[PDB]
Design an enzyme around this catalytic site. Sequence first.
Site: not given
Ligand SMILES: Cc1cc2nc3c(=O)[nH]c(=O)nc-3n(C[C@H](O)[C@H](O)[C@H](O)COP(=O)(O)O)c2cc1C
Ligand SMILES: O=C(O)c1cc(=O)[nH]c(=O)[nH]1
Length: 370
Positions: A186, A309
């Site tokens: 991350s 995603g």
């Molecule tokens: C605001 C935000 C917070 C996120 N927090 C986490 C996190 O806590 N742990 C994690 O594994 N991924 C986190 N992600 C990543 C998402 O789980 C996901 O893998 C990423 O957004 C790609 O998917 P998408 O294109 O549909 O958004 C976060 C993404 C965003 C947008």
């Molecule tokens: O908490 C976050 O900043 C966060 C975690 C994560 O795994 N992926 C991400 O985009 N943000």
Amino acid sequence: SYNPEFFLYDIFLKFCLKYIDGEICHDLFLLLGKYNILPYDTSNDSIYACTNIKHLDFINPFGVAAGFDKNGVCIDSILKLGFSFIEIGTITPRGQTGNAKPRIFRDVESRSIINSCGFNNMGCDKVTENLILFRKRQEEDKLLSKHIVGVSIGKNKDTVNIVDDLKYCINKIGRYADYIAINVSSPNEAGKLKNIILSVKEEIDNLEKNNIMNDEFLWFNTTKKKPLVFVKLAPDLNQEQKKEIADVLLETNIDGMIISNTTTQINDIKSFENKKGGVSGAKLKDISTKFICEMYNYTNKQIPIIASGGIFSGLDALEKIEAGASVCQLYSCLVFNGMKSAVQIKRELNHLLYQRGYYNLKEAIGRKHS
Ligand SMILES: Cc1cc2nc3c(=O)[nH]c(=O)nc-3n(C[C@H](O)[C@H](O)[C@H](O)COP(=O)(O)O)c2cc1C
Ligand SMILES: O=C(O)c1cc(=O)[nH]c(=O)[nH]1
Ligand SMILES: Cc1cc(Nc2ccc3ccccc3c2)[n+]2[nH]c[nH+]c2n1
Ligand SMILES: CCCCCCCCCCCC[N+](C)(C)[O-]
């Protein structure tokens, strides 16, 4: 469209997108879910789009990714939008406030997001209490019956050892999880990963080993089995690193891989030029898909893949499935498309699976490899 609850909500979400800060919007919809005033998808999912990861059985192939409900405060209402599962977290042993606000920004035109949340969460003890209360409601709530809750777990920023942070989480919340996702990828070597993965599988084994209760009573979760162990991988890696990680995953016998987290490789979003953090959404789609193909290859098709995603449409989902994914997670789609996201995507996938002549979903998995 025709269903008024979803229609009213998605007018309201359009307004919020235009006027209101992203994190604020997120929290508002979390709060509306907590008070049970979001719409329900009460329709039967197609048996031809069921899927599984080992003995973890998904009623449909769509879940909500980690970071959406970090603290598990809205699990019921989010699932009841029509998702088969949700990954809560990422959680850490102690609570963390995260980086300075504002830290989530949307680019509507490219349907993308950048964030630098910095692992804000209430900490393991409180989230465990939130998940416990969910598990109790789940016994009473018919629409939650076979719905899966995974828990993403991570290290506190300043920890004395990653391994022991993860063990603390497992010991606290492991009994209530259907799966555990290791998030050491991350924003905000491989022998280190091997030891992390082995330490996690061991702590779960130890929950089983030294609890005196039968499994019916130890596993207060959906499967009534010990949680599977997945790892979530960042896409910003060289080809060597991917090969090395593949080896580690094969060797530790990992139950699955979540491909992928957000990327820092995106330079061409105008509104984000001043911003740091990881990029989600449509601009991540191709990167994530390429990464799925690669890891599917490097692991000899032996490791089940959870896709993430840039997934918005039935077509996007099928691309991920044919690249090698068994199941899909949405995040950005909920931000831009709203309450209807799961209903609409499931329908689109069903129509597409039929058009392509597939008998079921499992038939499509990995089909892009010759
Ligand atoms: C605001 C935000 C917070 C996120 N927090 C986490 C996190 O806590 N742990 C994690 O594994 N991924 C986190 N992600 C990543 C998402 O789980 C996901 O893998 C990423 O957004 C790609 O998917 P998408 O294109 O549909 O958004 C976060 C993404 C965003 C947008
Ligand atoms: O908490 C976050 O900043 C966060 C975690 C994560 O795994 N992926 C991400 O985009 N943000
Ligand atoms: C308009 C909006 C929403 C949102 N988040 C959502 C969207 C849908 C949800 C559905 C159920 C529960 C919570 C939800 C949260 N975000 N996130 C970051 N910007 C942003 N902008
Ligand atoms: C057909 C009914 C099954 C009998 C009920 C007994 C439940 C045993 C399963 C719990 C396992 C306990 N153990 C050995 C794993 O620690």
